[PDB]
């Protein structure tokens, strides 16, 4: 009819916005966790270098 189509369009705008936000948040999590794990690896290498210096 008439109002039904508009209501469907609203329900679809919510769909697109929610899905896009979810995908963006997932990409953010991937990037942040990669950052953290690379920092942890750098910390490990520093520990090993400290061990060599102690030797």
């Amino acid at each position: 009819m008439d109002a039904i189509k508009k209501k469907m369009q609203m329900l679809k705008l919510d769909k697109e916005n929610a899905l896009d936000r979810a995908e963006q948040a997932e990409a953010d999590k991937k990037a942040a966790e990669d950052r953290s794990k690379q920092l942890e690896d750098e910390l490990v290498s520093l520990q090993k270098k400290l061990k060599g210096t102690e030797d």
Binding site: D2, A3, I4, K5, K6, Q9, M10, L13
Partner: peptide, 19 residues
């Protein structure tokens, strides 16, 4: 969001109206 919101509002209004 407010714009599509008022769009939905006016559209459902006219929908009930022609109803």
């Amino acid at each position: 969001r407010k714009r599509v919101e008022k769009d939905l509002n006016e559209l459902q209004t006219l929908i009930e109206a022609h109803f």
